[model samples]
Target: MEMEKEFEQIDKSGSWAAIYQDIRHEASDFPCRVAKLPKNKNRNRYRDVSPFDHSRIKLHQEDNDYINASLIKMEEAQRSYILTQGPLPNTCGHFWEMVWEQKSRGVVMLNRVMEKGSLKCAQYWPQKEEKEMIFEDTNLKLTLISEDIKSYYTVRQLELENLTTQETREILHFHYTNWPDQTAPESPASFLNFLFKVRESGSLSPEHGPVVVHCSAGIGRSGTFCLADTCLLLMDKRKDPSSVDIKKVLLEMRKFRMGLIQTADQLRFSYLAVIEGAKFIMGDSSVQDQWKELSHED
Candidate 1:
């Protein structure tokens, strides 16, 4: 009731713009000294989107321990996520290294390699024909085990191996193929379906390391995905689902990383997905079929 009421109130007042602005204004800044070092300047995808040194994921094995990744933990929700910028061509090896060392069960990609005319991220994974990619720097080999394509997303089975140690690990790659950069997905039902599918994989569980989530900048779409998932999980645990204050939850999340839920529309979409997702958590099993149907709807 609380979420629904808040959702209706926001819609009735058309106040997402003001709310989004307040979120931006309330966002605190922290120093990312490593990201700004002369030698590490090129490691960051965007000048202003650096991860806080305290929360940033360190690449322990590398000579230079910097990667554009931050660990966002929601203790109350029992969830942890590694939010990161999409891999640059030169940093793909480092990307795999981070995944291997962190022991993450899955990697969630929310943007395409290219958006419109620009390159949003490097083709970090192996293509169909090649079926594998060898990262010389990290001495890691990534082999594509399988690919299951859907209308709006694709699930990939990948194997990451350390060439030197002969150690291998299976990684699930969940790619939301249709979410355009800087914008929200068109259907909340579909978005919820996608989120639930990821959840069903058990990758987001506490047993594993934090799932790695990324978009081009890692703060926008990546933030939206984490915010929605965290809010829904918290709602599921609480006796009264309405007690989850989406904005306050977002504010807590922003403390770990910088800007999350980039635009007012994305913030609005998070609420929409959460409201719809609450039904599934509240024991409305039929909603999954409805979401399944809506996901394929044009």
Candidate 2:
């Protein structure tokens, strides 16, 4: 009766925990439930001791097919807009393609690349000889951006010069950091600092076109950043109807592009980062308390 009463008045503000707790408590009253039955009877009644390859049997072939199709559609629906991910080599090519595709619509490419020689990892992707040669073999592009903490270092700007000629205008280079490895709970403050810079620079302007973000695989850190931006935009719109809901905006983005934050780790990190960001922005004491509670012994 208490469980039923609680379930009937479940608190929406309590998040997922309250709903799960209510379900668990209400399930306890059902004597005929599988979990409430005696262990031996339950075990024998549903025993599968004889090992067999069930794949060939195909008990729910049609149902399984439907489920798989639904899952594919669901995945497609979830990632239908604003972000695109691909292999590093393909990203550069894809960027050019996207620029050309939307050229008539007036979308410009605001390129952001990590300056070379900033970190040890820069050695892995050295600046191309031609690009470096144009600047007289000086590493100033890389050096200038890496040294500044407050600015967004863009490598170049690709503007549509008529329909045939695209001009490349050199811009400030960025000091890029690898996500998860370079950004952990300890390093989140710095990442947040970078996000503040982005916000200040108006990089997130919808009119400026989707903020093209990519790194090595374009899944971990980049995904987290994009997801956080989505959450913030959602919260902003909820708070102010005139504001843009970025997730909704991104869904439209996925219609033409695909595979935005495809990995499980990437998704998990995005959700975690959003929750952490919410806590930070709200200044909720509970978040800090929870962290201290969990990590007190560590």
Name model 1 segments beyond 4 Å from true: none
Instruction: Show the lowest summed lDDT stretch of 10 residues, model 1.
Output: 125-134
Alpha carbon deviation, residue 158, candidate 2 (Å): 8.9
Give each model's whole-structure lDDT.
0.90, 0.33
Q: Residue by residue across 237-286, what tens digits does model 2's lDDT show?
A: 45432243323433433232233343444443444455454554455546
* Winner by lDDT: 1
lDDT string for model 1 (46-165, tens) is 988989988999997747988999999898998999999999988898899899889999999999998999998999998773668999988999999998889889999999998999
| C-alpha positional error of residue 16 in candidate 1 after TM-score superposition, expressed in Å | 1.0
